[PDB]
Write a protein that holds these residues in place. Sequence first.
Motif, PDB file in Angstrom:
ATOM      1  N   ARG A 147       0.791  -1.358  -0.013  1.00 50.64           N
ATOM      2  CA  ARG A 147      -0.058  -0.046   0.208  1.00 50.64           C
ATOM      3  C   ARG A 147       0.741   1.249   0.038  1.00 50.64           C
ATOM      4  O   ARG A 147       0.591   2.180  -0.703  1.00 50.64           O
ATOM      5  CB  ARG A 147      -0.893   0.011   1.250  1.00 50.64           C
ATOM      6  CG  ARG A 147      -1.812   0.936   1.425  1.00 50.64           C
ATOM      7  CD  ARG A 147      -2.593   0.989   2.685  1.00 50.64           C
ATOM      8  NE  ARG A 147      -3.842   1.948   3.086  1.00 50.64           N
ATOM      9  CZ  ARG A 147      -4.323   1.828   3.899  1.00 50.64           C
ATOM     10  NH1 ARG A 147      -4.635   1.107   4.867  1.00 50.64           N
ATOM     11  NH2 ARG A 147      -5.385   2.859   4.262  1.00 50.64           N
ATOM     12  N   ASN A 148       2.003   1.378   0.839  1.00 49.78           N
ATOM     13  CA  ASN A 148       2.920   2.471   1.055  1.00 49.78           C
ATOM     14  C   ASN A 148       3.858   2.377  -0.296  1.00 49.78           C
ATOM     15  O   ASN A 148       4.630   3.643  -0.476  1.00 49.78           O
ATOM     16  CB  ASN A 148       3.380   2.828   2.008  1.00 49.78           C
ATOM     17  CG  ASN A 148       4.215   1.741   2.593  1.00 49.78           C
ATOM     18  OD1 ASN A 148       4.889   1.054   1.957  1.00 49.78           O
ATOM     19  ND2 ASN A 148       4.377   1.833   4.039  1.00 49.78           N
ATOM     20  N   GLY A 149       3.928   1.307  -1.214  1.00 50.14           N
ATOM     21  CA  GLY A 149       4.947   1.139  -2.136  1.00 50.14           C
ATOM     22  C   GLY A 149       6.206   0.317  -1.835  1.00 50.14           C
ATOM     23  O   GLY A 149       6.778   0.139  -2.871  1.00 50.14           O
ATOM     24  N   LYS A 150       6.438   0.180  -0.714  1.00 53.57           N
ATOM     25  CA  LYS A 150       7.487  -0.759  -0.298  1.00 53.57           C
ATOM     26  C   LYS A 150       7.542  -2.168  -0.886  1.00 53.57           C
ATOM     27  O   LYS A 150       6.434  -2.780  -0.769  1.00 53.57           O
ATOM     28  CB  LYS A 150       7.623  -0.782   1.257  1.00 53.57           C
ATOM     29  CG  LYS A 150       8.868  -1.452   1.803  1.00 53.57           C
ATOM     30  CD  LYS A 150      10.108  -1.194   1.129  1.00 53.57           C
ATOM     31  CE  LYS A 150      11.121  -1.994   1.489  1.00 53.57           C
ATOM     32  NZ  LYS A 150      11.861  -2.027   3.149  1.00 53.57           N
ATOM     33  N   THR A 151       8.497  -2.624  -1.607  1.00 56.57           N
ATOM     34  CA  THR A 151       8.619  -4.107  -1.909  1.00 56.57           C
ATOM     35  C   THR A 151       8.887  -4.956  -1.130  1.00 56.57           C
ATOM     36  O   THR A 151      10.016  -4.591  -0.284  1.00 56.57           O
ATOM     37  CB  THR A 151       9.424  -4.164  -3.471  1.00 56.57           C
ATOM     38  OG1 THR A 151      10.546  -3.692  -3.053  1.00 56.57           O
ATOM     39  CG2 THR A 151       8.897  -3.134  -4.356  1.00 56.57           C
ATOM     40  N   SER A 152       8.494  -6.125  -0.973  1.00 57.94           N
ATOM     41  CA  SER A 152       8.824  -7.248  -0.060  1.00 57.94           C
ATOM     42  C   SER A 152       9.836  -7.999  -0.566  1.00 57.94           C
ATOM     43  O   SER A 152      10.298  -8.922   0.290  1.00 57.94           O
ATOM     44  CB  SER A 152       7.409  -8.046   0.217  1.00 57.94           C
ATOM     45  OG  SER A 152       7.050  -8.450  -0.775  1.00 57.94           O
ATOM     46  N   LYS A 153      10.093  -8.295  -1.867  1.00 53.34           N
ATOM     47  CA  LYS A 153      11.170  -8.702  -2.539  1.00 53.34           C
ATOM     48  C   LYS A 153      12.185  -7.708  -3.354  1.00 53.34           C
ATOM     49  O   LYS A 153      11.200  -6.594  -3.698  1.00 53.34           O
ATOM     50  CB  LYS A 153      10.734  -9.906  -3.129  1.00 53.34           C
ATOM     51  CG  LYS A 153       9.890 -10.933  -2.661  1.00 53.34           C
ATOM     52  CD  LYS A 153      10.084 -12.378  -3.206  1.00 53.34           C
ATOM     53  CE  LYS A 153       9.388 -13.492  -2.189  1.00 53.34           C
ATOM     54  NZ  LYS A 153       9.942 -13.632  -0.930  1.00 53.34           N
ATOM     55  N   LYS A 154      13.236  -8.014  -3.495  1.00 56.98           N
ATOM     56  CA  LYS A 154      13.920  -7.215  -4.538  1.00 56.98           C
ATOM     57  C   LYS A 154      13.916  -7.506  -5.950  1.00 56.98           C
ATOM     58  O   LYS A 154      13.985  -8.383  -6.462  1.00 56.98           O
ATOM     59  CB  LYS A 154      15.681  -7.240  -3.960  1.00 56.98           C
ATOM     60  CG  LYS A 154      16.405  -6.081  -4.844  1.00 56.98           C
ATOM     61  CD  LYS A 154      16.263  -4.765  -3.918  1.00 56.98           C
ATOM     62  CE  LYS A 154      17.265  -3.816  -4.395  1.00 56.98           C
ATOM     63  NZ  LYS A 154      17.223  -2.462  -3.920  1.00 56.98           N
ATOM     64  N   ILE A 155      13.094  -6.341  -6.675  1.00 58.92           N
ATOM     65  CA  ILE A 155      12.881  -6.441  -7.822  1.00 58.92           C
ATOM     66  C   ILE A 155      13.967  -5.683  -8.816  1.00 58.92           C
ATOM     67  O   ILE A 155      14.036  -4.538  -8.494  1.00 58.92           O
ATOM     68  CB  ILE A 155      11.537  -5.815  -8.075  1.00 58.92           C
ATOM     69  CG1 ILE A 155      10.175  -6.176  -7.238  1.00 58.92           C
ATOM     70  CG2 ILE A 155      10.672  -6.224  -9.481  1.00 58.92           C
ATOM     71  CD1 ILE A 155      10.126  -7.677  -7.056  1.00 58.92           C
ATOM     72  N   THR A 156      14.446  -6.443  -9.734  1.00 58.42           N
ATOM     73  CA  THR A 156      15.636  -5.907 -10.536  1.00 58.42           C
ATOM     74  C   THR A 156      15.536  -5.999 -11.763  1.00 58.42           C
ATOM     75  O   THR A 156      14.827  -7.108 -12.240  1.00 58.42           O
ATOM     76  CB  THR A 156      16.988  -6.276  -9.781  1.00 58.42           C
ATOM     77  OG1 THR A 156      17.127  -7.856 -10.012  1.00 58.42           O
ATOM     78  CG2 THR A 156      17.034  -5.907  -8.603  1.00 58.42           C
TER      79      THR A 156
END
Length: 164
Positions: A147-156
């Motif tokens: 919801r606040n934009g933080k990712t739960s896995k590193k997207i590269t």
Amino acid sequence: VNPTVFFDIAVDGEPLGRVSFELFADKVPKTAENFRALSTGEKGFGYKGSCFHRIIPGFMCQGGDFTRHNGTGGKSIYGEKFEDENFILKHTGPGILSMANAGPNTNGSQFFICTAKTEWLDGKHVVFGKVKEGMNIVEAMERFGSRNGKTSKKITIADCGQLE
């Protein structure tokens, strides 16, 4: 004549898949060329190895900060931020590729991929491309946002370049 570019996406280092984009150089040449050159790396810097730092499900995936990796950095190929080229194209639905910015005429390298219709951005962000293949990969990335934009896995962006 419009160029095609690809992202190979990884998630915590594991391959996820390829997203390809048509860049509307016929419409927005300066904006398309910036993104194309950053995707090849031919100026010595660009998107390879950078992350999608802000992902909000049902809204958009934002990336392109290859400098500071968190939304505060990035740079264009032009030696300074550059102008909003035109607002001819609109935010019509999922797959639209558009420039992030910090107000009028402040384009650098950060961009976002819409996962919905976001018409309230029309006239504020320059639309310059659209997903051609691999929208399903963007949909898979989206699930690692919040919801606040933080990712739960590193997207590269594990690899990127120009096709055709």
